[PDB]
Design a binder for this molecule. Structure first.
Ligand SMILES: Nc1nc2c(ncn2[C@@H]2O[C@H](COP(=O)(O)OP(=O)(O)O)[C@@H](O)[C@H]2O)c(=O)[nH]1
Length: 361
C-alpha cells in the first residue's frame, strides 16, 4: 500500500494531531508500507524525508497547486485526511481528491455542531469520505446520525514501551514528591488555575513538593500568581519527546485539571504507559481513558479543594497508588500502536481495491 496522509497543522509545535500522524506514518512504514505526509511548512523542526510541505498559510495559490500535484503524482491507494475543518489543508485535499478517502475526526463538541457541519454546504465533500474514523463512540454515533453511513471508533495510539522503559530524569524520583502538569498552561481550559489553587493545601502536607510543568508559556505570570509558593514550580520548557517520556516516568503523579475542550485524553494515556498514577478533571474523555475511576482518580471539574485532596490522597496512600498504576498498565495496551494501527489498516483495506487510485477531482 501507498498511503497519502494530510496533517492540517505545522509540525513546528507539538499537538495531538501532529504527533498522531507522524507516529502512524512511522508505524506503517515499519510494516512495509510507503507513506507520504503532507502538512503546512514546518521549517523549525527536523522531519523525515517523506514529509512534504503544503506551504505556509497567510492558504494561497502555490498551496492549491501543491495539493493537486501531490495527489496526481502520488499514486495513492488510500488518502488519509486528519481533521478536515473548513478552511484547512485537509479540507483542501478533500475537495481536490476523488476515490479511496479516509478521514479521522480528532475533535468534536456537540451532536448539533456535528449534524450541521456534516449536513451543511460542505456535505458534498464530506460524502466523498468512504472510511470515517471518530475517536469516541458518542462522536461516531453522531456522524452516523448525520450522514446515514457507517463510521468507526478508533482511539489515538501511543508507543506504550517508550514510556514504560523511559530513563528517569536525574535526581528522580524525589522524596518531597513531584506532581506533573503537561500543556499550554495559559489557556484557561488546561486548568492551571485549579492546580495553582490546590498548591497551598498540597504544600502544607508535602512541604517539599515540586510541580514539574511541561509546556510553553509565561513562567513570569504563573510564578507571580503562585506568590510565596513559586519556589515549588519547576518549568521544563517545551522539551523533546524522549525527555517528556522521562519526565512522566519520574513524577509520582500526573495532574490533568483541564476545564473542557478535550476529545481524547492522550497525555493521560502517556502517563498510564509510563506507570505514573493519574489524577484527572473528569471530562467525558478522561472518564473513558481512566474507565470510571478504575485506572485513575477522577476529580470534579472546577474543584480546587477536591483536587488538593485527590493528589494528597494519592501521594500519602502508597497501596492506593500502586493499584492505580498496575490497573492502568494492564489497560493502556488498548491504545498501543499495534492495536490501533491494525484497526486503521482494516479501514484502509475496506476502502481500497485492486488497482484503484486516488485522483484529482
Ligand atoms: N515533546 C513534547 N510533547 C508535548 C508537549 N506538549 C504537548 N505534547 C504532546 O503533544 C500531544 C498533545 O497533547 P496536548 O498538547 O496537551 O493537546 P493540544 O495541545 O491541545 O493538542 C501529547 O502527545 C503530548 O505529550 C511538549 O511541550 N513537548
Amino acid at each position: 500500500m501507498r498511503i497519502g496522509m494530510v496533517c492540517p497543522y505545522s509540525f513546528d509545535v507539538p499537538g495531538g494531531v501532529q504527533s498522531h500522524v507522524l507516529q502512524l506514518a512511522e508505524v506503517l512504514r515499519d510494516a512495509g508500507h510507503e507513506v507520504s505526509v503532507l502538512a503546512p511548512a514546518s521549517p523549525h523542526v527536523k522531519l523525515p524525508d517523506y514529509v512534504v510541505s503544503g506551504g505556509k498559510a497567510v492558504f494561497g495559490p502555490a498551496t492549491h497547486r501543491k495539493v493537486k500535484k501531490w495527489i496526481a503524482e502520488g499514486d495513492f491507494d488510500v488518502l488519509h485526511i486528519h481533521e478536515p475543518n473548513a478552511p484547512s489543508l485537509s479540507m483542501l485535499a478533500l475537495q481536490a481528491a476523488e476515490g479511496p478517502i479516509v478521514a479521522t475526526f480528532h475533535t468534536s463538541t456537540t451532536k448539533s455542531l456535528t449534524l450541521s457541519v456534516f449536513q451543511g454546504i460542505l456535505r458534498p465533500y464530506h460524502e466523498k469520505i468512504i472510511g470515517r474514523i471518530a475517536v469516541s463512540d458518542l462522536a461516531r454515533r453522531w456522524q452516523m446520525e448525520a450522514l446515514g453511513s457507517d463510521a468507526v471508533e478508533i482511539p489515538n495510539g501511543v508507543d506504550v514501551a517508550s514510556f514504560a522503559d523511559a530513563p528517569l530524569l536525574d535526581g528522580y524520583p524525589r522524596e518531597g514528591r513531584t506532581v506533573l502538569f503537561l500543556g499550554r498552561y495559559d489557556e484557561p481550559r488546561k486548568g492551571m488555575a485549579v492546580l495553582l489553587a490546590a498548591l497551598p493545601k498540597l504544600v502544607a502536607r508535602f512541604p517539599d513538593v515540586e510541580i514539574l510543568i511541561v509546556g510553553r508559556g509565561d513562567e513570569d505570570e504563573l510564578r507571580e500568581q503562585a506568590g510565596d509558593l513559586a519556589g515549588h514550580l519547576r518549568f521544563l520548557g517545551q522539551v523533546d519527546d524522549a525527555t517528556k517520556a522521562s519526565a512522566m516516568r519520574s513524577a509520582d503523579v500526573y495532574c490533568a485539571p483541564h476545564l473542557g475542550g478535550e476529545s481524547f485524553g492522550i497525555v493521560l494515556v502517556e502517563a498510564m504507559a509510563a506507570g505514573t498514577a493519574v489524577v484527572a478533571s473528569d471530562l467525558d474523555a478522561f472518564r473513558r481513558v481512566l474507565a470510571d475511576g478504575d485506572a485513575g482518580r477522577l476529580v470534579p471539574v472546577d474543584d480546587a479543594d477536591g483536587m488538593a485532596a485527590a493528589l494528597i490522597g494519592i501521594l500519602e496512600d502508597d497501596q492506593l497508588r500502586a493499584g492505580y498504576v498496575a490497573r492502568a498498565s494492564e489497560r493502556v495496551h488498548r491504545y498501543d500502536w499495534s492495536v490501533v494501527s491494525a484497526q486503521i489498516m482494516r479501514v484502509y483495506e475496506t476502502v481500497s481495491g485492486a488497482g484503484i487510485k486516488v485522483q484529482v477531482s
